[PDB]
Amino acid sequence: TEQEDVLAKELEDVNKWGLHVFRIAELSGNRPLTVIMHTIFQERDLLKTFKIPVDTLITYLMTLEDHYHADVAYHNNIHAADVVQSTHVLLSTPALEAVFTDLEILAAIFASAIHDVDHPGVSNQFLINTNSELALMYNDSSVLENHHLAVGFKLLQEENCDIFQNLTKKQRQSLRKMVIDIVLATDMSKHMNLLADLKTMVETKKVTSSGVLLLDNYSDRIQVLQNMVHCADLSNPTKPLQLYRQWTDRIMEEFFRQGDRERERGMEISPMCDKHNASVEKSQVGFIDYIVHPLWETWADLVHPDAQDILDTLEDNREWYQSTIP
Ligand SMILES: COc1ccc([C@]2(C#N)CC[C@@H](C(=O)O)CC2)cc1OC1CCCC1
Ligand SMILES: [Mg+2]
Ligand SMILES: [Zn+2]
Secondary structure, eight states: OHHHHHHHHHHTTTTSTTOOHHHHHHHTTSOHHHHHHHHHHHHTTHHHHTTOOHHHHHHHHHHHHHTSOTTOSSSSHHHHHHHHHHHHHHHTOGGGTTTSOHHHHHHHHHHHHHTTTTOOSSOHHHHHHTTOHHHHHTTTSSHHHHHHHHHHHHGGGSTTOOTTTTSOHHHHHHHHHHHHHHHHTTOGGGHHHHHHHHHHHHHTOOBOTTOOBOOOSHHHHHHHHHHHHHHHHTOGGGSOHHHHHHHHHHHHHHHHHHHHHHHHTTOOOOTTOOTTSOOHHHHHHHHIIIIIHHHHHHHHHHTTTTTHHHHHHHHHHHHHHHHTOO
């Protein structure tokens, strides 16, 4: 069908920053995570490398995608697909050429796919403040991130869903550890320490004559993967403005809905969650200035000069958002 042909054409840009992820979500019948993951696995020859039966991969992907909520505006399957594809592009940076093994690549992509699964559309702090079952289970620390991991791994046990069935025991153990380390690093309470450590790595980074990073031990390798997926998670403001503005609309819808739940419970409304007292544009500029730019500038220094175009787009978008403030 024409819809299937147009979907294939859009997916030809899977290796590019700025993939039309919303259009792909529409054309795939709201299956962006499944089609983008399948495309990336084929592009990187992961099915052959890890002997993953195609039917097993598709079954797991559709199951995982089903566990993202269709009624949450931001933290849904489209965001997961976007983070997966962004991680996929970041793994292809010239400065990281042949740095990571196929198992590490598999771990980063898998982590990205499951990193927000079963997200309820409310924050860790909301879950702690409302004495939720999730906060009780996880003792108030990385509440959602622990849950995303637990769900992502548990789904591998469903019928014809174990995509890692042909990995050795050693490989399975290593992948599990890496995936946990990466997803737990997506918790924003860890951002400042993660960034501080990334800056320290950049100060004494070792590279070849071509500028390829030299990472020997697990601590340094996982640190780069953690920051890579964190960057992918915080990549909305570095995307073409047309995409970024859609992500902004979605996060604000989610925040306002949380604020509505807080108002219904008589709680103090969280910052940027009050639809009656919101400054959307000022908030995005602040997000860029205090979180996104500091992170991306540091990543750009690590892989210099491969991230220059991403940084250029970020700066263009900050300038535009600022211009909308009278
Ligand atoms: C496009 O805008 C945003 C996209 C993502 C985020 C998040 C951050 N930080 C929201 C919080 C989320 C988390 O803490 O898990 C991680 C992602 C925040 C964004 O903007 C902020 C929140 C409200 C306005 C500014
Ligand atoms: Mg998250
Ligand atoms: Zn996320």
